[PDB]
Symmetry: C3
Subunit: 227 residues, 3 copies
Amino acid sequence: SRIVAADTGGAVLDETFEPIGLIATVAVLVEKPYRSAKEVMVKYANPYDYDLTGRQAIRDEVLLAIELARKVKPDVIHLDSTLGGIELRKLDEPTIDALGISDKGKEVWKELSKDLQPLARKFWEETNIEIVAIGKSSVPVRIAEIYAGIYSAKWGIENVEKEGHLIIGLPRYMEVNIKDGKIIGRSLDPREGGLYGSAEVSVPEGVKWEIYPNPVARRFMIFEIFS
Amino acid sequence: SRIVAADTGGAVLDETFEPIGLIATVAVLVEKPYRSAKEVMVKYANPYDYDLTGRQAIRDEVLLAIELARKVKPDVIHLDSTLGGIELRKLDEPTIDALGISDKGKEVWKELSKDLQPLARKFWEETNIEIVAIGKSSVPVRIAEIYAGIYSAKWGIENVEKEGHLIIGLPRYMEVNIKDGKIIGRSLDPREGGLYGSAEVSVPEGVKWEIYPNPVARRFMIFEIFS
Amino acid sequence: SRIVAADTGGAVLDETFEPIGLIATVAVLVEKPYRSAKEVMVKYANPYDYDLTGRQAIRDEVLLAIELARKVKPDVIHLDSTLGGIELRKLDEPTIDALGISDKGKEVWKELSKDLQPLARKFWEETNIEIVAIGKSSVPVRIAEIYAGIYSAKWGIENVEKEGHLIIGLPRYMEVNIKDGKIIGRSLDPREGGLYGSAEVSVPEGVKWEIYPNPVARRFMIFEIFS
């Protein structure tokens, strides 16, 4: 089985540790043994002027996953939305209103559905690839979240000159390490079976970074970067 | 304190990673320091022709635990069913109907109790050993579930000739390793405090096995076997 | 950012593993990189003649945190109560009756707030330090809980002559190790990012200790001490 999955992302934080905007969306291709990505694509947002309210995030994920799936032709796309295991193709207002999710969730999806559902139908019609809202039980979605963290740290090493100082909130329970030109990212949860990832990075001279727990977000780490 | 507990089991999966049937039921005797089994007994089911619907599994566990408990005479049996520590002896329809579980749960139990309650009562009358429905908080229940994974793996090594290829779904967050005739099973969650188990196995010539994350069940591993 | 937090505690258990009373209340000063305490203060309860019913524990916590905060002057105090991060200062009956917690939770807090709310208000008026009911998401609160575990162990090494035998239930998923006059305590959960802490201990001649899983409370350890 060969799976494409997408996720956003790390976050730029305040001094207060409050998030101001998300950084990276990543789409990944995952095959046996399902511990890492075979292939990756990335799209960076503007974490300043990002609306944390609403889901520009899921819109970008679907879009990016479709793009990579056209290239790599997986059997299926996994979407990070825990809706059962349902096909995005079939998410019209009626089937949404029959879902076992909160009323607030239903409203959010009806707005999303207006364009995402025709998009998934068209994509399916010409590729036969389903987009399944499986969410939390998907290992590829988790791998994509690790990569979103990895490329958020990359976006931080790279953008720390423009900005003077960067506080980046990493996705849940993951660590990032930089040695000799590459960034390696890992789940901190051994229960997930050794999920990891990698990317190349060019470290400007004299930039330092530390990784440590976010005191106000337990189980999340901070990646802090100085110039 | 000396405790007996039982649990089923590992699963045979198809190519879609959907379970077709459970494999091993194991009862274990656990004593200080409560990290492993002092003694074990095993009953294999037929994973093909197995009804995943319903609960032949809990019926087999009670039956196996009772068998082992007559032999080793523990102080108590832990049953993998989270009701609030209640003795199976006293689970008649009226007490069930006042339990704090879902209505669907109450119906399963009423059916189950029809024969399991006289059984637990009879067994207690002659042994004074209770069967407590404690479930999730029980370490010996978790240790039993690791052994069920270990013996599902053993079942896999030894049944991999008849069947040409075998995909086994392990119980949550546990790994299996085979060295030199023994399968070692271990929890992957360090929070549980180093739970582990062991069994002997004779690995047929030229069979290979891999272990990797179940892509569609996060935090569950696959034990894959070839002939 | 510099944070004070408090928590109770470890527990003395009978032979059934049922708790009879809480042992240590600890306040800690936590700063970057938020993995440990910069400074600690402790207050032991009498675990015999302790009322597990109600919350003398949260009262002693606020009291102890305030005491340490007067000394080290952090920006904020984290309180171990998951109320949404509301300031203890403002917890009167009306705002409590509008919180999204259970009705049982509202009543406990109404009783608590009768003295805790004037207390927080007085303290704020002369210090400008808030006490925030942030709870579960707070790393400093989890670090205080590791320290309460560590000092419960200390309390056990030093009270094991008076009482012949001591069984101590450590806080959730944490281990304790003693080498050369030092107790080191660690979270067992790697997802937390390496939280740890330390205390000095004088181990009386010929006392023994063991750490192992509590069979009836999964993910909680026992610290068992002999004289």
